[PDB]
Design a protein around this nucleic acid. Structure first.
Lengths: 122, 316, 316, 316, 131, 133, 131
RNA sequence: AUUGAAAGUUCUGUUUCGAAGAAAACCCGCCUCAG
DNA sequence: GGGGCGGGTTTTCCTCGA
């Protein structure tokens, strides 16, 4: 069932990328993907956005029992996503799940949008 | 009868859309299962339905028939192929409804004389005494060939914007490029022949006189389908089609060629044509092949160069 | 009808853009299926959308109509082709919305006597009584020739900086070079003719009077497309264009010339035109060819030198 | 309009630079598609961006305007062409931002009465009410002539050392030699004319008064581009330039001369100019040719000797 | 021996990633569908490691984790990382390329291991800075 | 394959030239080559470096037991001793390799990748033995 | 036939180099940027070969490498060398000069081949003396 | 001639505007092909 | 008789709006 843990970590990555970029476009592309090409392109582009936030020190890992979290600073707003970001192995195992069923991209997109919406509402 | 299998190559195309979601227009896709050494893979591949082709064929037949003076219905002169289905449709044209079952044939003939499209295309009338007529042309779905271990088809989304001086303007369209193959059947022998048992009703002599012209028009209407005048979104997304392989068989008995999903599908259909003529006691069997991708053909086939020669030979 | 196929050679080009990532401006790219001696392959190649060509054609038509005294819409006077889609446009222009289906024709005429752009390029109104008018000019995506095994196209990124005396200014621009090909179609027999079926409505006499001028303006407007006045980023990235091959066919029956993908696409289309005229019972079929690369043409074909001569011949 | 095509010969050149790797300074290179007797090929050739040419032209225009008393912006007085893009520039100059769309014209006029550079080269303001103004001068990349089968261009690296008495100082510089060609366009009929649609605003009388001087300065500013005062690294790598061929066309209608890629591009453009004037119903078409390589020109063409005579004739 | 080769390739990819601070080569390696893509990454990562060796920012060492284990020290942007294990030999690269010519799966396996090594080291380094 | 043997012998030549010169510049030029000119220039320049090492007796062919004897090349550079296992290319190998390059410059990248792998493994082993001593 | 001409020119350059013990003519040939430099070397190398022929220190022979191959024996400073192949004809020199008038690249190709022949022969001769 | 017979989800739209990788730097100090 | 040595680059900016 680690499949759900992998999907949850991918959803956290998408939610961090959405909150930092203030753009739903990558989550929309991920949730509407019909091929491994579209999913893999979004996985790169969202990690490239997260990499810029890391280099600017606007995205950082933290703890908030203590739970792992990711702090995101965007346009003077502060957000905190609870959970881990995916590992390289999670991306590889998720891409294998997508090669079997692109449904998992829709599931991760739905979770990512739920995380982002709850944080934006708060 | 006439049977045909045709292979197409289309690039940067969007002809058959589907239900729009949000601000996006989506293409029509179907699932396929591909065999690999590791196992099986499920892939979504674009397709084109068999209703747009029928609509294009009927429109072309209307255009050709109105030039030669053949009768055309009022609602069919306008590109609205409702046909003589309900009472409201019959009211405009001016045809009395069938009385009972025994009179049904008569009604058919009357309809068969007031609209050519209702004859070749076929019609259905719902009511107390329904009448039926199966279409004389049969078309199938356009699906790209599943040949080898790779599917030569893609599907991407394109982003478009409209410019305004007072912003207060964004849409997306799906485009594809595949290698399509499709097959069709036509029975020119049954044209202008009623399809209901009974006794002959006055007015069949006109149908006998018009049989030749109707057959010629029906054969001529295939040129539009074989030339690529189907689908929609041609104003701004006009595609680029091309012909690769074509096999057409003319016989006097039921027969169909092999699907164009393999690289060698002409030799098989020629051998099967010979074998079927051997068993069904046929007399006429002719095959015309157009080859552009350099695949193996066989022996005993006339080789053409264009589609116009095919239509001329079919009419002859 | 007037159907044309044109080949262009463009170097250091960026006329069409898409969404940008970071400090990089990207060029539109599309997948293409190409045939090689080893089979079929899928590649990603830069392309140019046909909407830019349509916008350039409509702007040139607006300019010509304003110069020649033909009516031009208020919103269309400014280069904003929203046409009559929304209610705000109708309120600005001052045209009442259609009441029922029977009034739709009247509304169409009211739209058709005020803006030539709506007449030529078609329009849409959505509401209780939707009104549709298909464009009379059809274009497609601009794709480089898929000849041989190597695609003659290339794309790269270029580095640019902005100067400043107090650093606190760096961007990248995508540039492509290719040999583009595209085809177009224009049916001049339906210009200034209503499309919605109905009864006669006052005001058609003016349309009949202005039909000749509208057709002449529509034919003249093709000069901008055939010359190379289209696309954006022309202020600092002006491209180098050079015509290489052009085929134009004037017919009274539907016809489509071969795409400019193979080196021999003029002889084939001329032979196909002759056979199509023979088989479809036509009465007019003329061809014009402009050649600057020394490829095979054929026999009994008019040869021109520039594009202005072609435009004059089409007008005459 | 004034449209020109110019050919230059440059040796031991490095005016444009790109990102550096290690101790090597690289020269800008771009892909080009070239036609040979064996087909089409792709090559990598050094090029020069058009932004440097635009910067040189704008600097010369600044100098001329300051000498002739025309107003020059505060930030544009220093050679930093940020124009009025950001809010800091507006605060420094002292111009209030536009409030709504209806005020945009006023803002444009306020920008247009303070800096000639914004008027000629256009500008952009992004915000609640964006304001756009397209440049009135259009340039492109400088590409060597793609004549024959061999490209007349070469690039190499050179070795340099810095002397020091206490070693603890080595670099490489890229140097190119080629025969460059480029084209330019300038429409002087829209100088000192507002582009945003709206109502009359006080201050247009001053623009009408200064229109002649602005046009004269814009025409004079082309001397720097036609002479060879552009590019960087001129302190130690001063290039050797020599004019070879120049064509200038003055028309009242849109026109584009042929690129300087073929040896015969003057006769062709003169014939095309004559036919375009005939077909487009023009009223003015003049041509000037400067030739120093003894190639075919034609008949009935004015022949000049230097560039200053051309500038004087254009001014008169 | 196949697992040892894959582990040494994963160590090379992890060292190259930690030194360059870029995942791009590991992404290319794990998504490879041809021997061309794998071989290109094997060159480019070794070229990055070669620069780190010449700058003395990448060095082989031993570390006590009570026996000495072979390790590679990496200095990048003032961060210090230590990857435990050997770098691949020329024979390991050649035998790995032969494994890739049979099945490109081994590139995905090495990429997954390399990303795991890099992630664990980056997490530990961020935790020590926060304390 | 004989093509792989040729590429391996070219890689040994590049590795010997790199270890003797202590410069990666020729291997970098070889692996980045986009023309036969660049490849051929490196093949000359590396053999010219190897020729100097031969004349100085700092480059010599030998056999080494790794229990059968394998052909090897000993290289002495700056007081470091290196041993590359394998043969150097013949004139026929250079000519056949240049013909392979005229068909596909990919083979220069393959030889460069192998040469850098040989040199890196030898340099790592030499540094480890110095740290232990 | 172009490769055969280049190979015969390379044999001439290798014979001239082995006989003179000087690389100077091969260096001049491989660095040539004009037909003048190439033609001057073609004369000077043939003039060296002519002296070796007159002294009977350069001779054509056949050698079994089990079929007989054409070869050139060269005696220089008590060393014996054997170059396998033919020397160029007058027609080969003329056709080679026409190739050089089209592209000086062929001089670099012949120079690279000549140096390869000479290096292989010098290496083999030094190894036999050490044994 | 089969839950079969009879049907287009089709029409209308620029990701446009603007911005020099620029400044500094020696491959140079020593050599007869000679009797 | 088949050369030697010292050098293998430093800053500054990594998109703005609908």
């Amino acid at each position: 069932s680690e499949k759900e843990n992998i999907i949850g970590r991918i959803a956290n990555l998408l939610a961090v990328g959405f909150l930092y970029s203030e753009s739903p476009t990558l989550v929309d592309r991920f949730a509407n993907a019909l091929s491994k090409e579209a999913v893999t392109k979004v996985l790169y582009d969202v990690q490239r956005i997260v990499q810029m936030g890391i280099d600017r020190s606007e995205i950082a890992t933290t703890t908030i029992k203590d739970y792992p979290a990711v702090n995101v600073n965007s346009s003077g707003a502060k957000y905190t996503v609870v959970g881990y970001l995916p590992t390289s192995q999670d991306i590889e195992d998720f891409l294998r799940m997508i090669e079997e069923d692109v449904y998992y991209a829709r599931k991760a997109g739905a979770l990512a949008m739920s995380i982002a919406n709850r944080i934006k509402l708060g | 009868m006439i049977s045909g299998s045709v292979r197409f190559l289309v690039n940067l195309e969007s002809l058959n859309g589907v239900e729009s979601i949000g601000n996006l227009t989506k293409h029509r896709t179907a699932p396929v299962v591909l065999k690999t050494s590791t196992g099986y893979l499920v892939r979504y591949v674009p397709v084109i339905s068999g209703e747009a082709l029928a609509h294009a064929y009927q429109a072309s037949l209307v255009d050709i028939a109105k030039k030669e003076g053949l009768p055309v219905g009022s609602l069919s002169s306008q590109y609205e192929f409702i046909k003589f289905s309900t009472d409201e449709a019959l009211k405009i044209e001016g045809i009395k409804e069938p009385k009972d079952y025994n009179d049904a044939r008569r009604f058919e003939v009357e309809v068969m004389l007031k609209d050519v499209i209702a004859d070749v295309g076929g019609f259905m009338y719902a009511g107390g005494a329904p009448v039926r007529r199966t279409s004389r042309i049969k078309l199938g779905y356009m699906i790209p060939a599943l040949r080898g271990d790779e599917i030569p088809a893609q599907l991407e989304a394109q982003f478009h914007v409209r410019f305004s001086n007072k912003p207060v303007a964004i849409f997306n369209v799906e485009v594809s490029s595949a290698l399509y193959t499709f097959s069709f059947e036509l029975d020119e022998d049954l044209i202008a022949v009623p399809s209901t048992f009974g006794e002959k009703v006055k007015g069949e002599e006109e149908l006998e006189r018009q049989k030749a012209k109707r057959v010629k028009s029906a054969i001529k209407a295939l040129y539009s389908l074989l030339s690529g005048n189907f689908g929609g979104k041609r104003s701004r997304f006009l595609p680029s089609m091309k012909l690769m392989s074509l096999v057409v068989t003319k016989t006097d008995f039921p027969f169909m060629p092999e699907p164009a999903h393999d690289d060698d599908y002409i030799k098989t259909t020629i051998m099967r044509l010979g074998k079927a003529k051997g068993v069904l006691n046929g007399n006429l069997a002719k095959a015309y092949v157009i080859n552009n991708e350099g695949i193996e053909v066989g022996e005993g086939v006339t080789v053409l160069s264009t589609v116009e020669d095919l239509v001329v030979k079919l009419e002859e």
